[PDB]
């Protein structure tokens, strides 16, 4: 029974949820390692095909708890699901997800990723079951209706498309992209970087696989498909499909000479489902944004698309020494900027006050009816302006409950080619 | 065993061995972390003292390249014998400056470790009166300060011995400003030290009633109660608060005061506890101007410089206080510099932490480091301990928190 504190309103919240974590964080007693971007490889069952003493109890687990959460624990069919389960194991050496427990585990999935600010939003995830697909270009297919149904020309909804399990390992699905919708990056002949460093190794594999690259700064890269362990394909995402926002300023009638913009969707495609010990490495899945992830990561991280000095100068700014604080000005020029203009093509989007303010709500509403709620501080407060959003002052615990979102190698560095 | 610790913007890779070396708790278990908790998770025994004080001992004749030497081996000796007799022991000079500087080096949450080796060290574990007390604060903060050319530095006071005779400095700092709640519900100056401000005025303070009362010194000495003082106001260098370019700024009235001291925290060096322990360096410009001014629990001034900006406050997604915030940290900035007080910015600060932790890791093995509390208020990411990975344990020498002394002192007068 742990108690965290909010330092602005002095409401405590008792935890008794953490009680269910399955997971290491990667902290003891003596060591935190709270910013750690990927503290723990403690994973649920070992790296590929489990005998049936490991993946068993981590089906009955889930089960358990999807049947304890309708209230019908014991009942008949969770005692028939149990012995269900137990031989499809026995007979596959896995088993399948009723489409009620993919939605359950899906949502619950997406209620347990202590580093989403957006969780208040968790149990309305449409969720789309692709794993009949077989092909790459099933899964272009699947994920094309995905996009559509998530954009909804501008009045975005949340969404996640779930490709077949993982089997032996070798047979994986996956989005090699690590978003759907990300722009390309290119080595210069200088060293300069062109569009999004974030994605020159992917950018180079697309055009080694035969991509035929517009070299632009904001160049929607095509998506490289892998089902069924098959060496992945790539298609072109229909223009009309990705939504896009010009970026301008409310007040700065030159920012709109920069000639930025950005996608509407934000839509992460590198992750790995896991519920029930079943290991979904195809699960992109999408919500809307926060202005602060394109504006001050996508746009200002050094390494990303470090528009600050380009701003800055616009701006005329004293950009001689760091004390000025020009890079903070320019910062919320931008951000407003961003902010401003998806909201002008009514394109959903939250700032991050609004966002971090609902998300306080949201831990009061799961330590009220769920007796807590996993939080990662260092993820949830805002990478600008922390202190004067209210998560800055709110302590939160970080546990690892399952089913989960998990992250997962990249492909091409464990893809034998053929 | 290693842990390696990654900065996602420029891939450098540092290797910890240094957190071997804890062996206090820091509140997370294998299965939850508590990393953003506040304050997670009587005196010694003889028998707890002998360990911590060896461990101590060994570590300080390690780091003067005279571990297993016949001055060290004395000294343990030496050691033993006072706990043996006195149940605890006194440090050596060198000790005590070595000590107060490796609490220092340790702070997992100070930004400003880069300078921990250049701390003046005020031994005070003479003093018997609050007098005393306030005569070495008073000589600590002119020191310190130093017309504006401030200089980090400690006092160290008489360490505990049965806790019921601790030496306390009452104020959370040493030079704060009196908060006073209005009837109407309202507060006249800084909020936080509203309830401190009322222990003052209970023990004969006679206040001006003012939004930026330099508060009285509640000094405790030997267990006894505290006693009253006003630093000499010619002590206290502040800064009065303008913009570079915005001329209304200065209409808002408001100032600060330049040297940070914090007072209320306990050095714990070898299993001694100096209950008594006020130190101080050079303020963060974020310090001040965006917790200090912008908390809605503190001078909460956003409101105020939006409306002077002219900004739209009917609407967040406007950034009318990430607007209104950037400016008043660059009014602290601009002010401080202008009347020549040491000032580190935030971008600036980070940039050196950084440099001192590699630093750190590549002479010491590595640099204990609080994410939660390194990461700058404002402009988190684009300061570069944002993308810098870290290792959060304990080591001692510490500083530690304590229980605020009107919670745990029992009144001796009528
Ligand atoms: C509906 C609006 C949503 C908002 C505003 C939102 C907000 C955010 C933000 C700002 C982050 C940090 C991303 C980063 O810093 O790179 C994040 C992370 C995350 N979100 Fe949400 N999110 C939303 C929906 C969703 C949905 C639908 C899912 C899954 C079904 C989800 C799962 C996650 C996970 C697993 C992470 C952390 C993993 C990672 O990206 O590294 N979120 N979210
Ligand atoms: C020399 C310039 C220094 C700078 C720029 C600096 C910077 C900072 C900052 C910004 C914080 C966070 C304060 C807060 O958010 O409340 C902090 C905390 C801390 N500093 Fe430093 N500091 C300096 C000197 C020192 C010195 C001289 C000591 C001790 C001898 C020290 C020990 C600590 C400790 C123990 C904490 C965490 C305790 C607490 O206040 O909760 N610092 N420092
Ligand atoms: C490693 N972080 C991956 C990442 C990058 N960009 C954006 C997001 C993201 C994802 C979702 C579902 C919503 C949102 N508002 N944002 C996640
Ligand atoms: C809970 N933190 C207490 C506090 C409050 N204000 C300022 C500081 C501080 C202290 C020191 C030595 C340096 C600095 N630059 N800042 C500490
Ligand atoms: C090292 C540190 O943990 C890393 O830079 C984290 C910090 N907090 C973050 N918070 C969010 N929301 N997204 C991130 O990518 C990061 N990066
Ligand atoms: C809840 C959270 O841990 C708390 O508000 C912390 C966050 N980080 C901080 N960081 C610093 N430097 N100072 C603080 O007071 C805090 N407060
Ligand atoms: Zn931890």
Known sequence: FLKVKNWETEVVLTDTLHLKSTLETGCTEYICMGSIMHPSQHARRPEDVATKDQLFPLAKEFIDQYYSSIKRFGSKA????????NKEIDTTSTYQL?????????????????????????????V???????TAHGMFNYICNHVKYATNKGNLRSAI?????????????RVWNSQLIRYAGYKQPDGSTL??????????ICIQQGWKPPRGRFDVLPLLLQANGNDPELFQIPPELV??????????????????????????????????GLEFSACPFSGWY??????????????????????????????RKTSSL???????????????????????????????????????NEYRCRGGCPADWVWIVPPMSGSITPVFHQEMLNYRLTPSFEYQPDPWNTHVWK
């Open 98 to 126: 009723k489409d009620t427990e993919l939605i359950y585990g899906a949502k619950h999935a997406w209620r347990n990723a202590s580093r989403c600010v957006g969780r208040i939003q968790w149990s309305k995830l449409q």
């Open 161 to 173: 498309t779930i490709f077949p399990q993982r089997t032996d390992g070798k047979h994986d699905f």
């Open 243 to 276: 939504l896009e926002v010009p970026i301008r300023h409310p007040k700065f009638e030159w920012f709109k000479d920069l000639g930025l913009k950005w996608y509407g969707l934000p839509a992460v495609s590198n992750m790995l489902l896991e519920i029930g």
């Open 195 to 204: 569009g999004d460093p974030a994605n020159v190794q992917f950018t180079e």
């Open 78 to 85: 969770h005692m028939e699901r149990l012995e269900e389960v």
């Open 290 to 319: 926060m202005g602060t992830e394109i504006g001050v990561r996508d746009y200002c991280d050094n390494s990303r698309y470090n528009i600050l000095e380009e701003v800055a100068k616009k701006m005329n700014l004293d950009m």
């Open 326 to 364: 020009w890079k903070d000005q320019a910062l919320v020029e931008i951000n407003i900027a961003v902010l401003y203009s998806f909201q002008s093509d009514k394109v959903t989007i939250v700032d991050h006050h609004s966002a971090t303010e609902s998300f306080i709500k949201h831990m009061e």
């Open 128 to 134: 789309f079951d692709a794993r009949d697909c077989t």
